[PDB]
Amino acid sequence: YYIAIDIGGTQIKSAVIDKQLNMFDYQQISTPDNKSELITDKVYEIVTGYMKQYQLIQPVIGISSAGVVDEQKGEIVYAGPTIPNYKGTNFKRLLKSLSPYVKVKNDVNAALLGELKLHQYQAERIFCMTLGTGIGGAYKNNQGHIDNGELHKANEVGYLLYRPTENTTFEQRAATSALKKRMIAGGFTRSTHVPVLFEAAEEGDDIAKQILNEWAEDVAEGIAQIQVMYDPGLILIGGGISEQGDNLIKYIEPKVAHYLPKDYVYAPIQTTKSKNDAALYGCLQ
Amino acid sequence: YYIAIDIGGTQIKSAVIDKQLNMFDYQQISTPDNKSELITDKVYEIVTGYMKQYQLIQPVIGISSAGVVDEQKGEIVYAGPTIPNYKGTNFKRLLKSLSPYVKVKNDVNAALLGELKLHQYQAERIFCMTLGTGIGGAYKNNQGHIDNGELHKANEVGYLLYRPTENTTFEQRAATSALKKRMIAGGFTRSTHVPVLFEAAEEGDDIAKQILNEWAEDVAEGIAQIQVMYDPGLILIGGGISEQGDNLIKYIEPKVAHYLPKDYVYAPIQTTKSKNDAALYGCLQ
Ligand SMILES: CC(=O)N[C@H]1[C@@H](O)[C@H](O)[C@@H](CO)O[C@@H]1O
Ligand SMILES: CC(=O)N[C@H]1[C@@H](O)[C@H](O)[C@@H](CO)O[C@@H]1O
């Protein structure tokens, strides 16, 4: 049995996984604020809880986490403000008395590797962008490798497209909290729950549609820059919002052409086929 | 003896090169408009001229060219408007009765490879951006490869940052023709020659300075997107303008921080040490 743990700003998910990739004992808790209740403390108790439940000695532990991960060190070496005080968090050191077999990866690295372990694709070059609390990226290159860059922060695509006159990055315009502000800013008051926004647009609510289009325009703009850099065979959209599937793609994919030359052929854009668990599988790779 | 030919929008450069990388018989002609005088005709006669001069049978011919290059086909498979009617140009077919040993690479691929053959760098990941007629890119990754993407158009960074309200791409704001327009638009007195603009700014010309800064702002904005995607160890600026050296860098490098978070560490930005000839060496690599 392997222990998998996926750390986001909103939730920590975890599971025990066996050799055949079967998931047991899936758990999902609210992420501690990391001020008075610490993420490391919760991760440690998640691990010890599985070790106690299953009488595990030195379990192989995979950690997927938001933030820039130095994978060799097992450490958060750079972190946006979604998780405060997160830089310097070293999960290998944290867990060393429980196990010497700890891997740590960025959450999008894990999502992509998990997606690719569960689903085959023809494309040789696959970029994954997650839309959720944050926006993150990972790129599986031609030779099968996911490179994290010289300082491990490659594909932090949330930092794309900083607009000086608006003081926003890509992530500050397209992340869940930004979309929720756009909803209330755009007069959508039925709810503040993103799925309801999509449901309203599907049943022909013009305010839901205008908010979604204006948001998908900014999302498409970010995808276009990834496209231009990488020219990938495939762009996967993951994260919580990926549950919309084609109802999400239909807003974003046509708009990518707005930021590309008229004759420029860009990669197909699809949601991840595994919606929730991709990172739990990927963090063991 | 190898034949090297480097095709830009403005100039075609060529030379004969021997095993020790000594360059002989360097030539430089104005690039035909590719309307009534054809680039292929000039390349063919450049090759036959070298073949006769040196009595070369089936010479190895390296071709470096602006445009998206399918290296295996030896073909321009996509070309922006800097060179008209260029899509479909196949240099292997063009030269097949002269030689079966023809290589074709994108001009920035060749510039980077030539640069790296002449100069060693600490960085493992090196991005090269050329500023000139067009703007182009190439990235030597961790494992030493330069990947051209799924459809060979990776790192065509001139298409970055399309602004719908201005109808401009990165290249349409930062390429030479754009800088000259900015010079004329900005009231600049002395000339419309980019070297003169830099000389004027060095001699305390406030209009030259303002034009350079506003343009360097747009260049830095593009460099920042490359930085965010790749997190490279080094960003080389090539093209004719690289001969300005630190007088170019000093305008562009500090401004890259404007499009990145306050604590974000970006790569050193340097000009290529090879100023004119990098691509002639690179197209044989
Ligand atoms: C700390 C940080 O910069 N996190 C990014 C990235 O690391 C995550 O992968 C992405 C998804 O959560 O958005 C996050 O904003
Ligand atoms: C035909 C085309 O689109 N060329 C790009 C790119 O291929 C070149 O590498 C770059 C440098 O000349 O500018 C060019 O604009």
User: Do both A154 and A55 map to the same domain?
Assistant: no
Ligand 1 site, residue A137, Cβ cutoff 6 A: no
CA distance A143 to A46: 35
Residue A137 token pair? 């990226």
Give Cα B145 distance to the centre of its chain.
18
Nearest bound ligand to CA A107? 1
Cβ contact B149–A124 (<8 Å)? no
* Number of domains, chain B: 2
Instruction: State the Cα torsion B161-B167-B170-B176 to the nearest 10°.
Output: -170
User: Do both B79 and B176 map to the same domain?
Assistant: no
User: Do both A121 and A232 map to the same domain?
Assistant: yes
Number of Cβ within a 10 Å radius of residue A217 = 18
Query: Which of B105, B121, B144 delimits the end of a domain?
Result: B105
User: Do both B178 and B234 map to the same domain?
Assistant: yes
Query: Which of B105, B140, B170 delimits the end of a domain?
Result: B105
What letter represents residue B258's amino acid?
A: H
**Experimental method of this PDB entry:** X-ray
On the CB side of A103, CA atoms within 13 Å amount to 18
Strands B2-7 and B61-65: parallel
First vs last Cα of chain A: how many Å apart? 14
User: Do both A32 and A136 map to the same domain?
Assistant: no
Sort out which chain B residues have CB atoms less than 8 A from A150's CB and list them.
123-125, 231-233, 267
Number of Cβ within a 10 Å radius of residue B173 = 23
A193 conformational bin, left if phi > 0, alpha if psi -120 to 50, beta if neither: beta
Please enumerate in sequence order all residues whose Cβ is within 8 A of that of B172, keeping only pairs 6 or more positions apart, or say none: B158, B178
Strands B234-238 and B269-271: parallel
- Let me know: does B132 contact B242? Beta carbons within 8 Å: no
Residue minimizing CA distance to atom 10 of ligand 2: B136
Query: Which of B85, B105, B125 delimits the end of a domain?
Result: B105
On the CB side of B283, CA atoms within 13 Å amount to 31
User: Do both B87 and B134 map to the same domain?
Assistant: no
Print the domain residue range for B71.
Answer: 1-105
A74 conformational bin, left if phi > 0, alpha if psi -120 to 50, beta if neither: left
Distance from CA of A158 to the nearest CA of B (A): 9
- Report the DSSP beta bridge partners of residue A270: A236
User: Do both B124 and B213 map to the same domain?
Assistant: yes
Strands A126-131 and A135-140: antiparallel
User: Do both A92 and A198 map to the same domain?
Assistant: no
Please enumerate in sequence order all residues whose Cβ is within 8 A of that of A189, keeping only pairs 6 or more positions apart, or say none: none
Residue B30 token pair? 């104005």
CA distance A265 to A247: 22
User: Do both A43 and A129 map to the same domain?
Assistant: no
User: Do both A72 and A190 map to the same domain?
Assistant: no
What letter represents residue B77's amino acid?
A: V
User: Which residue's entry shows tokens 């630190």?
Assistant: B246
- A81 C-alpha vs ligand 1 centroid, how far in Å? 9
User: Do both A93 and A199 map to the same domain?
Assistant: no
User: Do both A230 and A161 map to the same domain?
Assistant: yes
